[PDB]
């Protein structure tokens, strides 16, 4: 297991926009409670999974636990950076696995909900 993505960076400019507040309070916390959220609530544990291949394939890992900590630390400058982290998490899953795999069906259900929730954001 490599070190998880950084969730604090002080040479980084921080913002709390209305959109970022919404991404934490509404978007992430709704996804967090989805029945299929749990594989995505923390980094892939390759050691537990006995998947020495995973981090040899996925070079920019991302998960909702990391995103949640970033949002709580005001890590992001704008909502687009946070949405990009969500999109990296989903894309990683689609890259490493194959269409129709169980974990892909879970990611697809979360992404459907994610896209529903971010279709309209605060002003
Ligand atoms: C369907 C399913 C769902 C979760 C697990 N699992 C258990 C247990 N403990 N940790 C997990 C778990 C958590 C996240 C992922 C995966 C398994 N898969 C595996 C499965 C390919 C790959 C590595 C992937 O891209 N992601 C996002 C194992 C199977």
Coordinates of C-alpha atoms and ligand atoms in Angstrom, one line a residue:
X1 CA 0.0 0.0 0.0
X2 CA 1.5 3.3 -1.0
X3 CA 1.1 6.4 1.2
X4 CA -2.5 7.8 0.7
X5 CA -3.0 11.0 -1.2
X6 CA -2.2 14.2 0.7
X7 CA -5.1 15.7 2.6
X8 CA -3.3 18.7 3.9
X9 CA -1.0 21.1 1.9
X10 CA -0.1 24.5 3.3
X11 CA 1.7 25.8 0.2
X12 CA -1.8 25.5 -1.3
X13 CA -4.4 28.3 -1.5
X14 CA -7.6 27.4 0.2
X15 CA -11.2 28.5 -0.4
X16 CA -14.6 27.8 0.9
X17 CA -17.0 28.6 -1.9
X18 CA -20.7 27.9 -1.7
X19 CA -20.2 25.2 -4.3
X20 CA -17.4 23.6 -2.2
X21 CA -19.6 23.7 0.9
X22 CA -22.4 22.0 -1.1
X23 CA -20.0 19.3 -2.4
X24 CA -19.3 18.3 1.2
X25 CA -22.6 18.8 2.9
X26 CA -24.9 17.6 0.1
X27 CA -23.0 15.7 -2.6
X28 CA -20.4 13.7 -0.7
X29 CA -22.5 13.0 2.3
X30 CA -25.4 11.7 0.1
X31 CA -23.0 9.4 -1.8
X32 CA -21.4 8.4 1.5
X33 CA -24.6 6.8 2.6
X34 CA -25.3 4.9 -0.6
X35 CA -25.5 1.1 -0.2
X36 CA -22.6 0.7 -2.6
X37 CA -20.4 3.5 -1.2
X38 CA -18.2 1.5 1.2
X39 CA -15.5 0.3 -1.3
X40 CA -14.9 3.9 -2.1
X41 CA -14.8 5.3 1.5
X42 CA -11.1 4.8 1.9
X43 CA -8.1 4.0 -0.4
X44 CA -8.0 0.6 -2.0
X45 CA -6.3 -1.7 0.6
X46 CA -4.2 -3.8 -1.9
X47 CA -2.6 -5.7 1.0
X48 CA -6.0 -6.9 2.3
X49 CA -7.2 -7.7 -1.2
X50 CA -3.9 -9.4 -2.1
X51 CA -3.8 -7.2 -5.2
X52 CA -0.1 -6.3 -5.6
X53 CA -1.1 -5.3 -9.1
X54 CA -3.5 -2.5 -8.3
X55 CA -1.1 0.3 -7.5
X56 CA 1.1 -0.9 -10.3
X57 CA -1.8 0.0 -12.7
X58 CA -3.4 2.9 -11.0
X59 CA -0.9 5.8 -10.5
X60 CA -3.3 8.5 -9.3
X61 CA -5.4 6.8 -6.7
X62 CA -8.4 8.6 -5.2
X63 CA -11.3 7.7 -2.9
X64 CA -14.1 9.5 -1.1
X65 CA -12.4 9.3 2.3
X66 CA -9.6 11.4 0.8
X67 CA -12.0 13.7 -0.8
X68 CA -14.0 14.1 2.4
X69 CA -10.8 15.0 4.4
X70 CA -9.8 17.4 1.6
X71 CA -13.1 19.2 1.7
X72 CA -13.0 19.3 5.5
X73 CA -9.5 20.9 5.3
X74 CA -10.7 23.4 2.6
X75 CA -8.0 21.9 0.5
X76 CA -9.6 22.9 -2.8
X77 CA -9.5 26.3 -4.5
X78 CA -12.8 25.6 -6.4
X79 CA -15.4 23.0 -7.0
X80 CA -13.9 21.9 -10.3
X81 CA -10.8 20.5 -8.5
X82 CA -13.0 18.5 -6.2
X83 CA -15.2 17.2 -9.0
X84 CA -12.0 16.2 -10.8
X85 CA -11.1 14.1 -7.7
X86 CA -14.5 12.3 -7.9
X87 CA -13.9 11.7 -11.6
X88 CA -10.5 10.3 -11.0
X89 CA -11.9 7.9 -8.5
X90 CA -14.5 6.6 -10.9
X91 CA -12.2 6.5 -13.9
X92 CA -9.6 4.5 -11.8
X93 CA -12.3 1.9 -11.2
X94 CA -13.2 1.7 -14.9
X95 CA -9.6 1.4 -15.9
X96 CA -8.5 -1.3 -13.4
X97 CA -11.7 -3.4 -13.8
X98 CA -13.8 -4.6 -16.7
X99 CA -17.3 -3.5 -17.7
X100 CA -19.9 -5.6 -15.9
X101 CA -17.7 -6.4 -12.9
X102 CA -19.4 -6.1 -9.5
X103 CA -17.2 -3.2 -8.3
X104 CA -17.8 -1.4 -11.6
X105 CA -21.6 -1.7 -11.1
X106 CA -21.1 -0.2 -7.7
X107 CA -19.1 2.7 -9.1
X108 CA -21.6 3.3 -11.9
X109 CA -24.5 3.5 -9.3
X110 CA -22.5 6.1 -7.3
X111 CA -21.5 8.0 -10.4
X112 CA -25.2 8.2 -11.6
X113 CA -26.1 9.7 -8.2
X114 CA -23.0 12.0 -8.3
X115 CA -24.0 13.4 -11.7
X116 CA -27.6 13.8 -10.5
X117 CA -26.4 15.9 -7.5
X118 CA -23.8 18.1 -9.3
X119 CA -26.1 18.9 -12.4
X120 CA -27.2 22.0 -10.5
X121 CA -24.7 23.6 -8.1
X122 CA -25.1 26.8 -5.9
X123 CA -24.3 30.2 -7.4
Ligands
LIG1 C1 -17.5 -6.3 -5.7 C2 -16.4 -6.1 -4.6 C3 -16.5 -4.8 -3.8 C4 -15.5 -4.5 -2.7 C5 -14.4 -5.5 -2.5 N1 -13.4 -5.2 -1.4 C6 -13.3 -5.8 -0.3 C7 -14.0 -7.1 0.1 N2 -12.4 -5.1 0.5 N3 -11.9 -4.1 -0.3 C8 -12.6 -4.1 -1.4 C9 -12.5 -3.1 -2.6 C10 -12.5 -1.6 -2.4 C11 -12.3 -0.7 -3.6 C12 -12.0 -1.4 -5.0 C13 -12.0 -2.9 -5.1 C14 -12.2 -3.8 -3.9 N4 -11.7 -3.5 -6.4 C15 -11.6 -5.0 -6.6 C16 -12.8 -6.0 -6.6 C17 -11.8 -5.8 -7.8 C18 -10.8 -2.7 -7.2 C19 -9.4 -2.8 -6.6 C20 -11.3 -1.3 -7.4 O1 -11.1 -0.7 -8.4 N5 -11.9 -0.7 -6.2 C21 -12.3 0.7 -6.3 C22 -14.2 -6.8 -3.3 C23 -15.3 -7.1 -4.4

